DNA sequence: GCGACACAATAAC
DNA sequence: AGTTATTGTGTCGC
């Protein structure tokens, strides 16, 4: 009924089929590590301004809620939240040096303003994009939005337990204790240590995330989860690391920039999950039906 | 099959 | 040692 796997940090992931077993909404059993991600490809090279050294980049993503491993499939529920977190790392550059440096795209050099992550959902069989929606904790009593592009600086990915612990914090004292895990406050650095051209100072806002945390995410309510044959559709979640540049023939999305003008999110690397099954609202997907 | 509202279990405090 | 928050899901009604 419950299959248990040990996570990297010693917590457990407890996989169960909601067709057979109903567990409380806030049970720790709802938190579990989802499918592993795989490299799709690398795109535009990034080099340091003077040294010319190529920046080695790696997305570090994890799903922490919403997916179960059931008979060799990864299964989510349309009605329910998932959590997808990601950082990135730069194997050949420590953070403190990285923030003081400047970087160009090798396309022919475009200056990188900042690094960012976005997520997408796709039909894994035909590459069609599928809309994602997010809620606040207030859900229907608050706004709905689509996942946004998240400026980030490189950081290790927090342990599964840390994401759990930080999922619904309001208390100021606890917020302070997790602050350094999730944010860099540029307004707190010594500005005298940085050149005008430094990467840190081309980030759009003073509060800079170290971790992209997409919580309370769902596939759009209008998604069809079955093919016409009644076979399950296969979906995939994608994480894309990009460099944002000033647009003043390679893969990129347009981006509503800080100063209002046109911006360019130039793809650097992309990872995705293996195929995912999503169970719809049908009564037969729930243990209540039995 | 979807938007909306309802209920209720365990976290958060 | 209480109250309020969050979220899986039951149900309504079109």
Curated annotation (Swiss-Prot):
**Positions marked as site (Interaction with DNA):** 26, 79, 139, 170, 216, 281
Q: Which keywords appear in this protein's UniProt record, sorted alphabetically?
A: Cell cycle, Cell division, DNA-binding, Meiosis, Nucleus, Phosphoprotein, Transcription, Transcription regulation
The induction annotation reads: Induced during prophase I of meiosis. Requires protein kinase IME2 for initial expression and continued transcription during meiotic divisions. Can autoactivate its own synthesis.
Query: Which terms does the UniProt entry file under GO BP?
Result: cell division; meiotic cell cycle; positive regulation of transcription by RNA polymerase II; sporulation
Effect noted on mutating residue 25 to A: Reduces DNA-binding by 65%
Compartments annotated for it: namely: Nucleus
- DNA-binding region(s), residue ranges: 1-290
Q: What is this protein called?
A: Meiosis-specific transcription factor NDT80
Organism, by scientific name, is Saccharomyces cerevisiae (strain ATCC 204508 / S288c) (Baker's yeast)
Species classification? Eukaryota, Fungi, Dikarya, Ascomycota, Saccharomycotina
Name of the gene: NDT80
């Amino acid at each position: 009924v419950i299959l248990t796997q040990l996570n990297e940090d010693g917590t457990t992931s407890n996989y169960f089929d909601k067709r057979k077993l109903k567990i409380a909404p806030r049970s720790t059993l709802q938190f579990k590590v989802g499918p592993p991600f795989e490299l799709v490809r690398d795109y535009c090279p990034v080099v340091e301004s003077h040294t010319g050294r190529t920046l080695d980049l790696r997305i570090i993503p994890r799903i922490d809620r919403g997916f179960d491993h059931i008979d060799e499939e990864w299964v989510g529920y349309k009605r329910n939240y998932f959590t997808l977190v990601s950082t990135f790392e730069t194997a050949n550059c420590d953070l403190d040096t990285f923030l003081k440096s400047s970087f160009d795209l090798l396309v022919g050099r475009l200056r990188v303003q900042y690094f960012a992550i976005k997520i997408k959902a796709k039909n894994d069989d035909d590459d069609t994009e599928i809309n994602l929606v997010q809620h606040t904790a207030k859900r229907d009593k608050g706004p709905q939005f689509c996942p946004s592009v998240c400026p980030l600086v490189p950081s290790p990915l927090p342990k599964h337990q840390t994401i759990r612990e930080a999922s619904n914090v309001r208390n100021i004292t606890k917020m302070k204790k997790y602050d350094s895990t999730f944010y860099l406050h540029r307004d707190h650095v010594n500005y005298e240590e940085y050149g005008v051209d430094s990467l840190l100072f081309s980030y759009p806002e003073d509060s800079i995330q170290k971790v992209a945390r997409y919580e309370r995410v769902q596939f759009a309510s209008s998604i069809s989860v079955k093919k016409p044959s009644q076979q399950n559709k296969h979906f995939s979640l994608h994480v894309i690391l990009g460099a944002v540049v000033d647009p003043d023939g390679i893969p990129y999305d347009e981006l509503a920039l800080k100063n209002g003008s046109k911006g360019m999110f130039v793809y650097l690397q992309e990872m995705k999950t293996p195929p995912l099954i999503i169970r719809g609202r049908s009564p037969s997907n729930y243990a209540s039906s039995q």
